[PDB]
Design a protein around this ligand. Sequence first.
Ligand SMILES: CO[C@@H]1O[C@@H]2CO[C@](C)(C(=O)O)O[C@H]2[C@H](O)[C@@H]1NC(C)=O
Length: 163
Amino acid sequence: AKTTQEKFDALKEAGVFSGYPGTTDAKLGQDMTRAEFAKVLVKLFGLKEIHGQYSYKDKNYDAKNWAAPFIEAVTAEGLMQAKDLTKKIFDFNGKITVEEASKTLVTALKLEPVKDAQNKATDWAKGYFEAAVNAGLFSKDANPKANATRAQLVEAAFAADEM
Ligand SMILES: CO[C@@H]1O[C@@H]2CO[C@](C)(C(=O)O)O[C@H]2[C@H](O)[C@@H]1NC(C)=O
């Protein structure tokens, strides 16, 4: 019965979340960005931020971009990668679908995708979305093809942290 905001507040006490500068609004109903998901992965899984390195050519991907040390850490692990692998564009403000987040979290948690799963996800992601639902990361009624909200990543992170 813990509310999503209560889960956010617990995770903020734990250092996994921090919210936005200068405001207490967690913006739980907005879509999470790729940069924000990289940060949460680093904190959840005990990865080390990598400073001073820039693998991507996106505009404003530089030392003034708060998310670069997190993005570099998850990139070096193979947990995330460029949206355009040839042009080296990460798309840091881009969105992330439920099924994409499922793949990444299941991998990071060392969970195994379910073979021969039947669900609404894209074919390549069905096993991962099923594993994520079975592990309590996302609701069985989540739309795997929709962009994941910050709320959903709070719920997922809270569940992953408890594991
Ligand atoms: C713009 O500042 C960032 O905001 C990010 C929002 O999303 C998450 C995942 C969060 O912890 O809520 O990450 C935040 C970044 O850490 C950063 N916030 C701060 C306070 O520096």
